[PDB]
Design a binder for this molecule. Structure first.
Ligand SMILES: Cc1cc2nc3c(=O)[nH]c(=O)nc-3n(C[C@H](O)[C@H](O)[C@H](O)COP(=O)(O)OP(=O)(O)OC[C@H]3O[C@@H](n4cnc5c(N)ncnc54)[C@H](O)[C@@H]3O)c2cc1C
Ligand SMILES: Cc1cc2nc3c(=O)[nH]c(=O)nc-3n(C[C@H](O)[C@H](O)[C@H](O)COP(=O)(O)OP(=O)(O)OC[C@H]3O[C@@H](n4cnc5c(N)ncnc54)[C@H](O)[C@@H]3O)c2cc1C
Ligand SMILES: C/C(=C\c1ccccc1F)C(=O)NCc1ccc2[nH]c(=O)[nH]c2c1
Ligand SMILES: C/C(=C\c1ccccc1F)C(=O)NCc1ccc2[nH]c(=O)[nH]c2c1
Lengths: 542, 561
């Protein structure tokens, strides 16, 4: 999983993922994913077309402005660079819906002027120094998977914009098997990181759904959350050490002690900084011996409410498996539709992934079914759970499909206290229906949720919103506005601005209310100290 | 659990803890703790005296005004109108001019502080703290918050050249539990509540935080947050940074508070971490929400002996490797094992030597781990079996719940032993670090040797007591806790000698890959290593926050920076 410099060689220039992976109608008229990459690749999905048709009512470049002394100086460094249109455009965006439109059927207002590929910490230092000398703006990019407009170049940035691409700074530097830590360069992808560690019998277990492309550096910048955080932690639990290149100089602690009291933890000044302060060049991450065994599972509940109560109880007992997700009825129908009692309009389903030693797994599993049983939960099968999880890496490919048929969609997320979850889900799902009907959407949108992570004090709730934009004169406007209304509803119902996606430029307008005016001023004060001239000018957060 | 305004009524004006609790020689000549507060209170310790004598070479029988209150009269008038209680009394000011570092206790015992608070205030709620901070801006006052007064980093010491009126802003009357959210398992509390009072009140509704630092009788929620406190049972409950879900902070710039109680967010750098570890330099933490748990149904103590310390460390490391650490596991070195042996009740022969006594009862090599499990009875007992099976693989032999039980009770009594030692020319202090697993054994060996070399070089006559234990396990390493003591007779400046040996031990720790601090923090004791520890830029970032939040340095204890 090493991303080539010319990403378009391997990855779609106008959508998610690998060129060799796209949904298509096979020779029996059923949807199937092309290629051989995924466990679902080449697997007929006989009832998927039907689900779609039912749900959605369908039938189925600016020049590079660059100082020449800067270019001359960059040449002496031997850092690879490009002023080519296709390289700059590829890095002008992440994976928000509006972005994917300007990429497809249009053009962006502002794209990087020059792409650089540092291969190490010292190259990054050179680049930041050049940027100070020539007054250049740096927007770091790893995987390019931001869903927060975090990579968008500000339209009125008139400095030369360097896309500082970390994909070629991608080595494991050392694996410390005495301490179970691995020190890595921050451009390594999740997939490559896990592939290499596995060969030595280790894993990080950090598995965001973006792992094929998202990077260590990206995870730390956005406070990324992984599917197995219950065992391995989120990124703030995984990172033991980091090295950061700012215009002021290099941030690094002098020791690898597991926990300190040496004033406010400066690691948390950089985590969540969203490329506004400097470049995370290296990090030390906790590793674990690869689990012996993995088992999937599922549980049906009479309704969503009972499911929530069961996840809560599971959280209260602190016996969550590696992953536990609760799907509302719509997502359950969706899952059922991708295969190769109770009131059925409200029936909910949890999917389970257990991992560890086989005997402890088996024992754990029994415990979880016994708890579920007390909330009306019924074992619903391993193959079901397993399919739910094997879907994880393909959903991203479904947009491109949808777009071909005038279906537009996006997911969004929040975290909320346990006592707000049920109301928040209902109220947000209802708000989306209402806004859509009021803006002229002809068919009630898909408006669905799942509880995706559990904590002592609450849960991450993950929503999908999508609609057939038939007979709508401004579909992107309608979409933007409804998604902003959804957000408003989430905040009204006690939900957070973001669980894991981050703020970028998409949720900027709510940050000050979320963290307080003095909080905002604290973030500003660090920004102005570390980067007084705003070299790191993506304008995320603040 | 409530700390009274005139603390010296309940607590010792000149040393640790409650007035009713000191070590004395009983009518048999045995050391015993007065009072009835602890399980060991009124329990004779017949070999303790022998151990003291053998360790420090003393006989034991042979024993061992103030600056005026400078305060503006208009401020005083405005303060009278708020009905916030206050005091300019010297006993009230002196009590809050220090924590529990050795030098501070010396200056109490045989001297005077260079600088003490000019006035003490007792806010009773968040709005009172806002009014006080408003007045400090208006009259240009310096505020040093105090909760428990249990700092071991010079974090409460008033800087000698601070010429502004110093307010000791005592949080002890802001001690309520504001709500208990049983749906989300969180409690929202005022910051001056002590750990003992917090646990007692919560247990009445069936809950606990399980945050149990050895100072919990006096240390407060606000204290814990300021200093990144670590508790004995963090393996179950977390350290303070895992326990806090929410906080409210009064700064000169305004009030910090997030607008929601979501369990985990990605909304930029986590500003809770700007506050955690701020050591009273930014503002007053007035309230916090803390995760709670059902009170555990059952506790099980235990102990395991290993052939040596190194085998004990390998065992703890494997326990950490399989992520099955109990509520608490602590590995003591052989000297601490001997010490523990010397606080038991069976009266030995005066003619059989102690070392031979102990041996009859390699005993100069053996190390002992003490253990606490708590939770559901079923799970606790399965878990204990699991840990004891791992320990068997490293030569570990079960050593009795009795010793585990005694180990855990001693934790709250040891602090009273300073007061005792100071009566007999013995000074010492504990200190700590965290370190990667692969540095632990070498670090411990090397620090103990440095301390021996340094004492000898500085004229100390007896070899110092210099002992260690591993008090916490993490995935990436351990917390190491040291005790250092010596008889100071024949030394001309014993504080200088201690001070300089302490600093040299610290240099040795850092040179062995240890941290500057695991939990005690920086205060004004470790400031000179801080830049080196967190980098020049990282230091500049803390300074940028201080300069923004507290531009005129109202929170002027001068800790950290
Ligand atoms: C299909 C899909 C699935 C996803 N699943 C998850 C998930 O399960 N969990 C999750 O948390 N998120 C998820 N995301 C969001 C995204 O993957 C994460 O936010 C991820 O952490 C971004 O990593 P990246 O390397 O792609 O960063 P990029 O998108 O390249 O950059 C993100 C931000 O960080 C900055 N940045 C990048 N590298 C560095 C660096 N080395 N130093 C300093 N700043 C830098 C950038 O300037 C930018 O502001 C998903 C996204 C998609 C599109
Ligand atoms: C015998 C003994 C045992 C100990 N055991 C432990 C232990 O197990 N674990 C551990 O981590 N530490 C321990 N300590 C150290 C100490 O108790 C902790 O650092 C504790 O967190 C301090 O709490 P406090 O309420 O006593 O704070 P104080 O000592 O009163 O204050 C400490 C610092 O925080 C500031 N402060 C206090 N309250 C506030 C507030 N509300 N807002 C802003 N700033 C504030 C003060 O200005 C000062 O800088 C121990 C100390 C002793 C003497
Ligand atoms: C864009 C999209 C879905 C979609 C497609 C068509 C119609 C409607 C939609 F919501 C989608 O899910 N992409 C995968 C994705 C995105 C962000 C994620 N965050 C996670 O934690 N995991 C993430 C996964
Ligand atoms: C000072 C001392 C013991 C002592 C007494 C006389 C001579 C030498 C000494 F080292 C001691 O341990 N006090 C209790 C104490 C202090 C700080 C602690 N921090 C912890 O985590 N736990 C703490 C416990």
């Amino acid at each position: 999983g090493i991303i080539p410099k010319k990403r378009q060689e391997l990855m779609k220039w106008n959508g998610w993922g690998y060129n060799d992976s796209k949904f298509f109608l096979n020779k029996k008229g059923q949807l199937e994913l092309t290629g051989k990459r995924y466990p679902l690749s080449g697997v007929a999905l006989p009832t998927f077309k039907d689900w779609i048709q039912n749900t959605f009512g369908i039938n189925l470049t600016p020049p590079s402005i660059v100082n020449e002394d800067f270019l001359h100086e960059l040449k002496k460094t031997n850092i690879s660079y490009s002023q080519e249109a296709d390289d700059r455009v590829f890095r002008a965006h992440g994976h928000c819906l509006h972005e994917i439109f300007l990429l497809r059927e249009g053009m962006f207002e502002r794209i990087p002027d020059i792409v650089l590929w540092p291969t190490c910490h010292d190259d990054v230092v050179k680049i930041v120094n050049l940027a100070c000398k020539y007054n250049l703006c740096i927007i770091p990019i790893g995987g390019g998977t931001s869903v927060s407009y975090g990579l968008m170049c500000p339209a009125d940035e008139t400095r030369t914009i360097i896309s500082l691409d970390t994909s070629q700074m991608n080595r494991i530097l050392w694996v410390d098997e005495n301490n179970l830590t691995a020190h890595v360069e921050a451009g390594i992808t999740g997939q490559e990181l896990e592939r290499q560690l596995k060969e030595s019998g280790y894993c990080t277990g950090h598995e965001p759904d973006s792992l094929e492309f998202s990077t260590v550096g990206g995870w730390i910048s956005t406070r990324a959350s992984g599917m197995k955080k219950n065992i391995y932690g989120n990124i703030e639990d995984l990172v033991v050490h980091m090295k950061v290149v700012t215009p002021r100089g290099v941030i690094e602690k002098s020791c690898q002690g597991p926990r300190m009291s040496t004033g406010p933890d400066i690691h948390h000044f950089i985590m969540g900084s969203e490329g506004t302060l400097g470049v995370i060049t290296e990090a030390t991450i906790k590793i674990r011996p690869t689990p012996e065994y993995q088992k999937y599972g599922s549980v049906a509940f009479p309704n969503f409410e009972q499911g929530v109560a069961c996840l809560r109880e599971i959280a209260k007992q602190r016996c969550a498996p590696a992953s536990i997700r609760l799907m509302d009825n719509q997502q359950f129908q969706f899952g059922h539709a991708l295969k190769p009692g109770f009131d059925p309009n409200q029936l909910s389903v949890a999917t389970l992934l257990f991992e560890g030693d086989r005997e402890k797994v088996l024992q754990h599993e029994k415990q979880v079914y016994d708890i579920a049983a007390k909330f009306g939960g019924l074992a619903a099968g391993e193959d079901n759970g397993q399919r739910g999880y094997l879907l994880t890496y393909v959903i991203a490919y479904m947009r491109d499909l949808g777009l071909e048929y005038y279906i537009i969609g996006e997911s969004f997320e929040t975290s909320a206290p346990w006592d707000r979850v049920v109301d928040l889900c209902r109220n947000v799902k209802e708000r989306i229906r209402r806004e859509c009907k009021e803006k002229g959407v002809q068919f009630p949108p898909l408006s669905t949720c799942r509880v995706t992570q559990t904590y002592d004090a609450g849960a991450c709730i993950y929503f999908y919103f999508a609609f057939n934009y038939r007979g709508i004169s401004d579909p992107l406007a309608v979409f933007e506005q409804t998604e902003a209304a959804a957000r408003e509803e989430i905040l009204a119902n006690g939900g957070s601005l973001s669980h894991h996606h981050g703020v970028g430029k998409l949720r900027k307008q709510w940050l000050k209310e979320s963290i307080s005016d003095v909080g905002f001023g604290m973030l500003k004060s660090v920004k102005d100290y570390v980067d007084p001239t705003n070299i790191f000018g993506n304008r995320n957060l603040l």
